[PDB]
Amino acid sequence: SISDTVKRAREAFNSGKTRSLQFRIQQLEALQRMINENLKSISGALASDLGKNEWTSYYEEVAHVLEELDTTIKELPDWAEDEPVAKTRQTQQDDLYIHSEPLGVVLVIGAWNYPFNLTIQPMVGAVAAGNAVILKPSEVSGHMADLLATLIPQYMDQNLYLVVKGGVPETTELLKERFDHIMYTGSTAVGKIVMAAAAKHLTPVTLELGGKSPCYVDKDCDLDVACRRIAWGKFMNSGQTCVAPDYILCDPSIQNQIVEKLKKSLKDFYGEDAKQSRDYGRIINDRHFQRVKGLIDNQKVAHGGTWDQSSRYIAPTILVDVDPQSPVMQEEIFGPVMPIVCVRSLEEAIQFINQREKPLALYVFSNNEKVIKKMIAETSSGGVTANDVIVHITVPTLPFGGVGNSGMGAYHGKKSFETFSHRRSCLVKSLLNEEAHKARYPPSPA
Amino acid sequence: SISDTVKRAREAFNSGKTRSLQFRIQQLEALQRMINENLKSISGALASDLGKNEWTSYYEEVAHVLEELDTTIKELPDWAEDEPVAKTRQTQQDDLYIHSEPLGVVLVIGAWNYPFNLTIQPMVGAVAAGNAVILKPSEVSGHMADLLATLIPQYMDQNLYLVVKGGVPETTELLKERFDHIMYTGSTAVGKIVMAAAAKHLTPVTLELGGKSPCYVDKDCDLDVACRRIAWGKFMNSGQTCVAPDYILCDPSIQNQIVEKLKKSLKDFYGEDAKQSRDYGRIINDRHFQRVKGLIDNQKVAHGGTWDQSSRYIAPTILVDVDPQSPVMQEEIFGPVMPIVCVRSLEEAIQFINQREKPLALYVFSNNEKVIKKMIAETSSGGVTANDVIVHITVPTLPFGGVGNSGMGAYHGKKSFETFSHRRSCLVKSLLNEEAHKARYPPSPA
Ligand SMILES: NC(=O)c1ccc[n+]([C@@H]2O[C@H](COP(=O)([O-])OP(=O)(O)OC[C@H]3O[C@@H](n4cnc5c(N)ncnc54)[C@H](O)[C@@H]3O)[C@@H](O)[C@H]2O)c1
Ligand SMILES: NC(=O)c1ccc[n+]([C@@H]2O[C@H](COP(=O)([O-])OP(=O)(O)OC[C@H]3O[C@@H](n4cnc5c(N)ncnc54)[C@H](O)[C@@H]3O)[C@@H](O)[C@H]2O)c1
Numbered sequence A, B: 001s002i003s004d005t006v007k008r009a010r011e012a013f014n015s016g017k018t019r020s021l022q023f024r025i026q027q028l029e030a031l032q033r034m035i036n037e038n039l040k041s042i043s044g045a046l047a048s049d050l051g052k053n054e055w056t057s058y059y060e061e062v063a064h065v066l067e068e069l070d071t072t073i074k075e076l077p078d079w080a081e082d083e084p085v086a087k088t089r090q091t092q093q094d095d096l097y098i099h100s101e102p103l104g105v106v107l108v109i110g111a112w113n114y115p116f117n118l119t120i121q122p123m124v125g126a127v128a129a130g131n132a133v134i135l136k137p138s139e140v141s142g143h144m145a146d147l148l149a150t151l152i153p154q155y156m157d158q159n160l161y162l163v164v165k166g167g168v169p170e171t172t173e174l175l176k177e178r179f180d181h182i183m184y185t186g187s188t189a190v191g192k193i194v195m196a197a198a199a200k201h202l203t204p205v206t207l208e209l210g211g212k213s214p215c216y217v218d219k220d221c222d223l224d225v226a227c228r229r230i231a232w233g234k235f236m237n238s239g240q241t242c243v244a245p246d247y248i249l250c251d252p253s254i255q256n257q258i259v260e261k262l263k264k265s266l267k268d269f270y271g272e273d274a275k276q277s278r279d280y281g282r283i284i285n286d287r288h289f290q291r292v293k294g295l296i297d298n299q300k301v302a303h304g305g306t307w308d309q310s311s312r313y314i315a316p317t318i319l320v321d322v323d324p325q326s327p328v329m330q331e332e333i334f335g336p337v338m339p340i341v342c343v344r345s346l347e348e349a350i351q352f353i354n355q356r357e358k359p360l361a362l363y364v365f366s367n368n369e370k371v372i373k374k375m376i377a378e379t380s381s382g383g384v385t386a387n388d389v390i391v392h393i394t395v396p397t398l399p400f401g402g403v404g405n406s407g408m409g410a411y412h413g414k415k416s417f418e419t420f421s422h423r424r425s426c427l428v429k430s431l432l433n434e435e436a437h438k439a440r441y442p443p444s445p446a
Helices: A002-014 A021-037 A039-050 A054-080 A117-128 A142-155 A168-174 A188-199 A223-235 A252-270 A286-294 A346-354 A369-378 A414-419 B002-014 B021-037 B039-050 B054-080 B117-128 B142-155 B168-174 B188-201 B223-235 B252-270 B286-294 B346-354 B369-378 B414-419
Strands: A095-102 A105-109 A132-136 A161-163 A181-185 A205-208 A214-217 A247-250 A301-303 A317-319 A340-342 A361-365 A383-386 A421-428 B095-102 B105-109 B132-136 B161-163 B181-185 B205-208 B214-217 B247-250 B301-303 B317-319 B337-342 B363-365 B383-386 B421-428
Touching (some): A002 A105, A002 A132, A002 A161, A002 A168, A021 A117, A039 A142, A054 A117, A054 A414, A105 A117, A117 A132, A117 A142, A117 A181, A117 A414, A132 A168, A142 A161, A181 A188, A188 A205, A188 B188, A214 A223, A214 A346, A223 A252, A223 A361, A247 A252, A252 A301, A252 A317, A252 A340, A361 A369, A369 A383, A414 A421, A421 B369, B002 B105, B002 B132, B002 B161, B021 B039, B021 B054, B021 B117, B021 B142, B039 B054, B039 B142, B054 B117, B054 B414, B105 B117, B117 B132, B117 B181, B117 B414, B142 B161, B181 B188, B188 B205, B214 B223, B214 B346, B223 B252, B223 B363, B252 B301, B252 B317, B369 B383
Parallel strands (some): A105 A132, A132 A161, A181 A205, A361 A383, A383 B421, A421 B383, B105 B132, B132 B161, B181 B205, B247 B337, B317 B337, B363 B383
Antiparallel strands (some): A095 A421, A301 A317, B301 B317
């Protein structure tokens, strides 16, 4: 069966229909009308999985896919043209260009936290490059899994773009098929499993994993604006975002000031009780609810610390004077718990960060430009945003991807089209004349 | 032991010395003077492994590395600079750019057919990107392995750039270590193993594997020039070249003409008897001598066919009316055997190619531009060259890589630098002011 589904998609790609640029634009526009016409359903699905509301849904997920769709629908023609290359002395009379072409069948494996985004956005790039795409939605956010399984065949081509539903068993069986590229977003442990399956077929993979994205706060920094931005990004989806400020690094002198401004900003967004605000989200499930909660134990709780097991609620909690060897500083906190670790100097912040796996993101808050550049020039991470948070992943002109444990590969905008296609180097010398190649053929000069 | 060597490099890389662009250039120039001061020895080692003479050693191998070095040394500074990115409406005031940075320790595993180039060339891009490099020379070309293992320590940094000699057991053990990138040039089967090992540490890999590079000769084509060019690339290293025109596909009407024109050029390069020409290479070893030799059995030998077991010689043999199901058409011929397979049309030539694993190269010879374009546009291969052979692999401005079975990743010139480094996206808003982001923070509008 799963095999039959993969076959159906490959044979249809072999038909050559996706070779038409016109076709891709129509499909892309189908995807676009699918979203617009079903915003309500998508929002509702999102509400049932993570308790989002019409606004957080659109602005945090859906609105990003739509910007992607718009960029690529408009630029695709330019992206598809043969890219000319710089000629060398030897190639002055020859054509040297780069030809892009579909890879074939791409597997897009999504995640639960942003179930609509982490599945449809990569797909925009995959359809743009002329590939057939098989979506494997996360089963953890089951409501969106179903919606996508129903919506896709109502708008997309039913032979080229297919949705496979299922948990671990369905995926494992699916990873035995042969794809020309596997896009995966999830955990570092499972990322390994994915790559290992791909090795058996020599298939290339794009891996967006995660880690602990540090957030360095410099003394010379408007702490009011700084903390207003940091709080937004950190509690945005109940702390469940891949490029979220996992923990704060700062000098002990501003330790408490950070705390006050954070809780201030918390009040401005969610009022006195977060559990009252409709804009605050709920944790995905019980297992994660227990693990995030357990991370607050034997810790110095300065704010928050309360939770509601029934609604899978966990109050915007802040922790102070945290021990880097404690569990909140040993695992990626995929929740609303903000630890604050203290470092005596910038040198100290850098050594700290560099003593751990490379993160998907790195943030620096400072008024001193030199501090911003020294942080960047001396650390390594997928992407970076100085004096803000999350935002770098939202710019089409900035490719999104990790390094080391944060993963490999990138994918927003044109970088998506490139990744889901092959870039073939062609040197054309249709000039079968002017054979001044004499010097290359033997016999060798005596 | 191998563990300690890897430790030496990783710690050395942590010292941060490669960061200095000045250091890199000195290590790049050092490598350059190693080549320039030891040409005789390099050629010697090539002679003993593949029976190459100073002329074929330089122009086929050594001279390509020297061009790469010359390009990177001159363009490194510009390649290293942060790359500005196009701003969006929402980011007009901010800084958006891409910062390149070393990955760490890079393992380069080379192949025997071109033992100097296949190790030192990818290394050039690795050193340029500020990484520490560990060379794993092919043991099969034993002489180049001992040469390299002694020359490197004399010119390069003895902590940063280290050579590891060994066969299977040593490489196996060596593949358990953690590297930040693995460059590999070899067979498809071993490529699958290298990537499997890679999976364990989530390390990215550049794989240049092989396949059977087709060569379609069109009717409307100057058969003289064509065959002159094809004979040169095909027999260049006793046929032992990764991008060599593996077999010819043509209309029977010219089946015999090509044969005549090929053997004519053969006379022009190696005289009447190739076993007499000093410009003709010898098969690496006995094992390969036998496999290649056997591909001539049960075949219609239209030229050559003689061989000397003692000197591992195999004459420039041609074969006509070859059956696709015969062993010469089932495996990549890594020798001087050139089969001719007939097809009734261009559409047919295309279907033949697509019905097989993707090749590293695809060559087209014709005077009709439209046939060249229709060919490229309907097939897929790593690279392509129209009306010549091998040549695209020699243009630095042209990235070299495969697709599907021919491998993943590319590595010439600047593309080499990009590949051995991390391209980190940065969004700098040193502007902690003009905070008109109100519309993004909760509570959602009523
Ligand atoms: N889901 C995400 O976006 C995500 C991303 C990064 C880190 N994390 C964090 O990592 C931890 C565990 O998260 P989780 O998402 O693994 O929990 P989970 O168990 O709820 O989700 C597991 C996902 O992994 C898949 N999977 C499990 N075994 C597999 C296998 N053997 N082969 C292929 N796929 C397999 C499942 O089918 C499932 O969809 C938590 O701290 C979580 O916050 C989650
Ligand atoms: N060497 C090349 O550049 C090359 C490239 C493409 C295709 N080929 C072809 O493929 C066929 C076999 O070639 P070959 O070079 O494998 O012959 P070979 O046995 O002489 O070379 C084997 C190489 O593979 C390595 N290897 C073997 N087992 C390994 C393992 N288990 N883990 C890691 N590395 C391991 C060896 O250490 C060795 O360097 C021939 O037809 C040949 O022409 C060779």
